[PDB]
């Protein structure tokens, strides 16, 4: 009777549902899965000792987007998202700054508190090399006396 109901329903769906290449020839629910990932991160981040320059953040749809002002025509803001939680001290992270930078943050991230340090250092260097990048242009341009 199964095949009778199949020919009643036009065709024989067990053939395509069982055959591979023959199957090769023959949205609101997904949105709610991203919001459930922030409830897990928000409690571990909520328990740990977040540094003072990182107390302000904006929980975005499936991520935590936190900012701190600098320069270079942008703001030092990053997006963070991960999965593990069982370890309270160390917290694996998956972040991005708003090809080498991606693997560098995926490299230093795969080891919570470390992220800032590295970033801080980087910013510092970029502020030095800001200075360097300015001094060069001062050494070439309006450099009257070099002594």
């Amino acid at each position: 009777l199964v095949t009778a109901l199949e020919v009643l329903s036009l065709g024989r769906p067990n053939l395509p549902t069982h055959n591979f290449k023959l199957s090769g020839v023959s949205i609101g629910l997904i949105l709610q899965r991203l919001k459930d990932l922030n409830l897990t991160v928000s409690i571990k981040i909520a328990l740990m000792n977040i540094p003072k320059p990182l107390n302000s953040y904006h929980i975005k749809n499936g991520r935590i987007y936190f900012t701190v002002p600098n320069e270079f025509e942008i703001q030092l803001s990053t997006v963070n998202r991960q999965s593990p939680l069982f370890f309270v001290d160390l917290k694996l992270l998956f972040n991005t700054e708003a090809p080498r930078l991606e693997k560098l943050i995926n490299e230093i991230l795969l080891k919570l508190l470390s992220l800032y340090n590295f970033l801080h250092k980087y910013v510092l260097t970029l502020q030095l090399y800001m200075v360097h990048r300015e001094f060069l242009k001062l050494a070439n341009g309006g450099k009257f006396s070099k002594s």
Partner: peptide, 19 residues
């Protein structure tokens, strides 16, 4: 309807592929 399947599905048991 089931009445078509009780009288039509009986002829599907006797049938070799066509040659």
């Amino acid at each position: 309807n089931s009445t078509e399947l009780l009288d039509y599905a009986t002829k599907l048991s006797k049938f070799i592929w066509p040659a």
